[PDB]
Amino acid sequence: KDIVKILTASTTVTKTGPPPISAECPHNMVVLFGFVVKQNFWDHTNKLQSYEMEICESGASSCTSKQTNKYDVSYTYIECGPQALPFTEQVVSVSGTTYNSVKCPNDYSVLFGFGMATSSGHQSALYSYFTPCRPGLKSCSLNMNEHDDKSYIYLVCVDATIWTGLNALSMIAKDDLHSAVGELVVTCPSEGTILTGFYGETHTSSPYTVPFGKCAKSLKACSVHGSHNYRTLFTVALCKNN
Numbered sequence: 001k002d003i004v005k006i007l008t009a010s011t012t013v014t015k016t017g018p019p020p021i022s023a024e025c026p027h028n029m030v031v032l033f034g035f036v037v038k039q040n041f042w043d044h045t046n047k048l049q050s051y052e053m054e055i056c057e058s059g060a061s062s063c064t065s066k067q068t069n070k071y072d073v074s075y076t077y078i079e080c081g082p083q084a085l086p087f088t089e090q091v092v093s094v095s096g097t098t099y100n101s102v103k104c105p106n107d108y109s110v111l112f113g114f115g116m117a118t119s120s121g122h123q124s125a126l127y128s129y130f131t132p133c134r135p136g137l138k139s140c141s142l143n144m145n146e147h148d149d150k151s152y153i154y155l156v157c158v159d160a161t162i163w164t165g166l167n168a169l170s171m172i173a174k175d176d177l178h179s180a181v182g183e184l185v186v187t188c189p190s191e192g193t194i195l196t197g198f199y200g201e202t203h204t205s206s207p208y209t210v211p212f213g214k215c216a217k218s219l220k221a222c223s224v225h226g227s228h229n230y231r232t233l234f235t236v237a238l239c240k241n242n
Helices: 003-008
Strands: 011-017 030-041 048-055 073-081 088-095 109-117 129-132 151-158 169-177 183-187 192-202 212-214 221-225 232-241
Touching (some): 003 073, 003 192, 030 088, 048 151, 109 169, 129 232, 169 192
Antiparallel strands (some): 030 048, 030 073, 109 129, 109 151, 169 232, 192 212
């Protein structure tokens, strides 16, 4: 079964906002995969206090977010297609030391995958950057710089003996740190076109005014648009090599 074929007729869905955010899915469509990112801001300095990251369950008409923990905004992304996928499992590993690395369960292979890094506390709150994981490999390494807090590697693992040609895919992730005082574009290698991805902005002070979205499919780049404690623009996507 060609995962390209079904990732083009799948339907990305993104949602940003404070509590409550559960991004939902179209008629009889189901969450193949996805993830949720929560930001938590001190009740006084209003600076950042922490990141959190969770998985959307397989076969659900909603990203069930799953809180009694305060959290002040959540960026949510789900790929939502017709059916749940067989032999496919999602993963988050988090770390604090230099390395952060993840193996795939039942010896699977990365289909989708990326690391985010942060540095919520020194005093440079959004050190938050982004890295790609390679389709095909069983791992995903990611060394973090120092005075980083935590690294969040999230990957969708497929059983590489039924999902074919993962070696034909590639993950792109560009980011750029905008100041606190003008655009961001990233394009596929090997003249590739997008399968699925997301584009957004994050802050270390957030007033609640919204900014987040999804990449367009069978196209060749992904684009954002800028809307101390400064804030970052990012783009993650996955490409097939044509």
